[PDB]
């Protein structure tokens, strides 16, 4: 061994392992085996605000700090005409309370 890696070969290796990570599934709102949706009985205007707050919370957990610098919830612009995918509505357009 003579040549040290000048940026650090394993230190790049861990970071590119982390950057390798594939695309996370988002399967809610889609029909299951039987024909039902796979969501949580939440309408989307609370659902997307909920998952945005949870993504900011996971971002703060990923950082060492307690309050996250980059945030996704209450950024400064409003998001009232917004709706994500979840399992309130079926494919047909009605309420999946049954």
């Amino acid at each position: 061994e003579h040549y040290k890696a000048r940026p650090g070969i394993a230190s790049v290796q861990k970071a590119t392992e982390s950057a390798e990570l594939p695309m996370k599934n988002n399967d809610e709102g889609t029909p299951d085996k039987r024909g039902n949706t796979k969501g949580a009985l939440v309408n989307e205007h609370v659902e997307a605000r909920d998952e945005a707050d949870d993504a900011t919370k996971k971002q703060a957990k990923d950082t060492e700090k307690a309050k996250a610098q980059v945030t996704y919830s209450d950024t400064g612009i409003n998001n009232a005409n917004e709706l994500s995918r979840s399992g309130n509505v079926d494919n047909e357009g009605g309420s999946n309370q049954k």
Partner: protein, 196 residues
């Protein structure tokens, strides 16, 4: 072929003046410092500053304008090459909408995906990315952090770009999974046409 960046680039140089005005970032910082200096100049816009702080103000703003910070030089030369290197290795290859400087008419506001054909008519099933105030999902930032990172930052004093990126880019390519994704996209496209 091209990677749309909101900043002008430059070939890879290391030796150049820290005070360069060809650099758009350093030009922008120097001229904004000069404008706020011009705001302070005559004291007229503010009463209540009972001491004459204009000398100390112009001093600290000029001391800010003359600074060692090589971050604008990094963002001009080195960073676009790094993004061009990283970009083919991604599990989610980049998805870009055109940047405009100041035209009102060429600003994109809505991105949507249609499922139907061009010839038929049906009820408008708008894709869910459209239901956003901006073009996409928002993302707040820390302007303090942006400013201090732009305002301070330097190089290792042994920097050879060929040696550095030769040691650096090599284990990154050792974790390439581009080829598996190229096998994957076949299955995706075949599944789409079988579905229709």
């Amino acid at each position: 072929e091209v990677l749309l960046l909101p900043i002008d680039h430059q070939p890879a140089n290391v030796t150049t003046p820290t005070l360069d005005f060809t650099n758009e970032l350093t030009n922008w910082r120097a001229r904004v410092c000069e404008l706020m200096k011009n705001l302070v100049d005559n004291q007229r816009y503010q009463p209540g500053w009972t001491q004459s702080l204009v000398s100390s103000m112009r001093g600290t703003l000029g001391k800010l304008k003359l600074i060692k910070s090589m971050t604008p030089m990094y963002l001009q030369q080195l960073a676009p090459v790094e993004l061009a290197v990283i970009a083919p290795m991604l599990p989610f290859p980049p998805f870009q909408v055109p940047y405009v400087r100041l035209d009102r008419d060429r600003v994109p506001t809505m991105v949507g995906v249609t499922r139907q054909s061009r010839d038929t008519i049906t009820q408008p099933a708008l894709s869910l990315s459209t239901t956003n105030t901006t073009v996409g999902v928002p993302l707040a930032l820390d302007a303090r952090a942006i400013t201090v990172a732009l305002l301070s930052g330097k190089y290792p004093p042994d920097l050879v770009t060929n040696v550095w990126y030769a040691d650096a880019i090599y284990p990154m390519y050792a974790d390439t999974e581009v080829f598996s994704n190229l096998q994957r996209d076949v299955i995706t496209c075949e599944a789409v046409q079988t579905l229709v």
